[PDB]
Amino acid sequence: SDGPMQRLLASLAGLRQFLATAKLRAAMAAFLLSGTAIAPADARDCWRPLLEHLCALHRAHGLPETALLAENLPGLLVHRLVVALPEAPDQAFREMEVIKDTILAVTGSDTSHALDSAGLRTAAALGPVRVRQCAVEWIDRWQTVTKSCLAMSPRTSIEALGETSLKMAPVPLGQPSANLTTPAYSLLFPAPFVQEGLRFLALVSNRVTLFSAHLQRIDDATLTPLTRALFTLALVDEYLTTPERGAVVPPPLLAQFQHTVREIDPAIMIPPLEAPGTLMARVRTDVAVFDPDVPFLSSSALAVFQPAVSSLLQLGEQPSAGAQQRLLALLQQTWTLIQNTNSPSVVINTLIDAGFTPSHCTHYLSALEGFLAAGGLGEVQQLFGCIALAGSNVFGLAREYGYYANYVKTFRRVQGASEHTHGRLCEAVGLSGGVLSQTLARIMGPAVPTEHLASLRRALVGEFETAERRFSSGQPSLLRETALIWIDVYGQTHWDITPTTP
Ligand code: NA
Numbered sequence: 001s002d003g004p005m006q007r008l009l010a011s012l013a014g015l016r017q018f019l020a021t022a023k024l025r026a027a028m029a030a031f032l033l034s035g036t037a038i039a040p041a042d043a044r045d046c047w048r049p050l051l052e053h054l055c056a057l058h059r060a061h062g063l064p065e066t067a068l069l070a071e072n073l074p075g076l077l078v079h080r081l082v083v084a085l086p087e088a089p090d091q092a093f094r095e096m097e098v099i100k101d102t103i104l105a106v107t108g109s110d111t112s113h114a115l116d117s118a119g120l121r122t123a124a125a126l127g128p129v130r131v132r133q134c135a136v137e138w139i140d141r142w143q144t145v146t147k148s149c150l151a152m153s154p155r156t157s158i159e160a161l162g163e164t165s166l167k168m169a170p171v172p173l174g175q176p177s178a179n180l181t182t183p184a185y186s187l188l189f190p191a192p193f194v195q196e197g198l199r200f201l202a203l204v205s206n207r208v209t210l211f212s213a214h215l216q217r218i219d220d221a222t223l224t225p226l227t228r229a230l231f232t233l234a235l236v237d238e239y240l241t242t243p244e245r246g247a248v249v250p251p252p253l254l255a256q257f258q259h260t261v262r263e264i265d266p267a268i269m270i271p272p273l274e275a276p277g278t279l280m281a282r283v284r285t286d287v288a289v290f291d292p293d294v295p296f297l298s299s300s301a302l303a304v305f306q307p308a309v310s311s312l313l314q315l316g317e318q319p320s321a322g323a324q325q326r327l328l329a330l331l332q333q334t335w336t337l338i339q340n341t342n343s344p345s346v347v348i349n350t351l352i353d354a355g356f357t358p359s360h361c362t363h364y365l366s367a368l369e370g371f372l373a374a375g376g377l378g379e380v381q382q383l384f385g386c387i388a389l390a391g392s393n394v395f396g397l398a399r400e401y402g403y404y405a406n407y408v409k410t411f412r413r414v415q416g417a418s419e420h421t422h423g424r425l426c427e428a429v430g431l432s433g434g435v436l437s438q439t440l441a442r443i444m445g446p447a448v449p450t451e452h453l454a455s456l457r458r459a460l461v462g463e464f465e466t467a468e469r470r471f472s473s474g475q476p477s478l479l480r481e482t483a484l485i486w487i488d489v490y491g492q493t494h495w496d497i498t499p500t501t502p
Contacts, residue, residue, distance in 0.1 A: 011023075058070055068467040074127065075188070077106060079191050081099065085197075104132070115127075131188070138180060149171075152208060153204060154240055156245065166215075176201060177201050190453070190494075194404075199400070222298070226265075230283075233273075237278040246276070249273050290323035291322055301355040302330050303355035304355030304360075310363050314367045344398065361395060368381060393418045405494040411444065
């Protein structure tokens with residue numbers, strides 16, 4: 001078992017028994033940009049002797065570089081401590097807890113005694129007390145928020161409770177992870193344990209977000225009982241049904257569905273909430289709900305009723321002029337809003353409010369594409385094409401929307417493959433020459449972390465200034481480049497920063 005920390009530990013022990021200058025110093029330079037990263041076990045076994053040898057070997061020679069690496073080795077270690085989180089919550093909180101104990105091991109009082117023993121400083125920006133404070137706050141708050149979202153989530157798993165329904169207030173996609181990116185945490189942003197925690201919390205949070213919106217249009221009174229029951233069927237199909245258990249329905253929701261569905265005109269037929277195939281398919285009718293004289297569908301949420309619409313767009317149907325005027329109002333409002341908005345929360349809310357639940361967007365895509373195969377579209381069909389392309393891609397990026405480094409990669413894959421998926425529709429409607437990648441880019445674009453890397457750079461410059469200043473009056477430490485290259489190379493490697501320095 002060799003590892004970077006292990007390699008420099010063994011290298012540094014032999015130095016203790018200006019050749020030691022070149023060897024020692026090139027060794028530090030080699031540790032700061034070793035390709036691999038430290039596993040928790042390695043840090044836990046090797047933290048003590050490496051720190052002892054570094055503090056005493058520091059004491060004998062008194063170079064600024066030993067002083068700095070000793071003063072800020074905790075943070076430089078958590079910068080390189082690998083994190084792998086499992087899908088299951090138990091395994092995830094467990095796995096995070098082992099790292100909490102790893103940093104507690106790094107930031108022990110023994111390190112403060114061995115730094116103060118060597119005349120060093122324990123209050124360094126990446127020093128033990130600071131790294132301890134920031135990591136502890138971030139991880140504790142991380143559990144509290146992640147479990148909070150995990151409780152008000154659709155719980156269809158084998159894991160036994162009853163899913164909350166009326167409980168939920170609409171949460172934006174970014175609000176849970178928002179406190180965890182404040183500039184206060186800039187010092188630890190490149191750490192894998194922030195990024196991994198943020199993808200986990202993003203995955204739970206976004207699901208809770210969609211579930212919140214769709215619940216909101218469940219419990220609305222202005223909507224017609226037909227529209228109400230339709231949102232109910234969609235909710236059940238997409239968030240409360242698994243291949244493993246047929247239907248997972250709370251008794252209050254099922255009773256509410258019963259009383260609301262008995263109000264519907266028997267001209268339109270609705271299946272009861274009970275366990276294959278989705279329920280939304282089971283709905284059958286012959287009435288043209290789109291006609292304005294007809295009062296059955298709320299003109300607000302008119303695309304919620306997937307069978308009649310999918311028939312409209314597969315069969316290229318020609319609605320009554322009043323019905324069509326009823327459509328182009330909603331479709332054209334929705335698409336004007338989507339076209340001219342940069343808030344993902346707003347576009348989510350307006351897609352769900354219009355009845356454009358993700359699976360619907362899918363069926364709609366399928367319906368048009370199949371139309372263009374057999375056949376140049378009406379404005380109804382073209383606008384459904386717009387909202388369904390942009391809707392499918394916004395809903396795809398929505399699950400993983402976060403401020404972590406991987407959303408750049410996923411976002412690149414998705415906007416790259418946005419237009420080419422269902423190319424006939426996309427070119428026929430106009431999103432062809434990069435326009436859809438432009439829209440998805442403006443609304444779902446990944447956040448830019450230049451400020452966090454700048455701030456951390458300034459802090460590392462400061463620890464360089466003090467650390468050299470005490471140990472070398474003039475300040476010509478050769479290791480500056482070696483420290484800054486990690487910053488630029490992280491920036492362009494994970495975040496694709498250009499990069500640039502002041
Ligand atoms: Na930089």
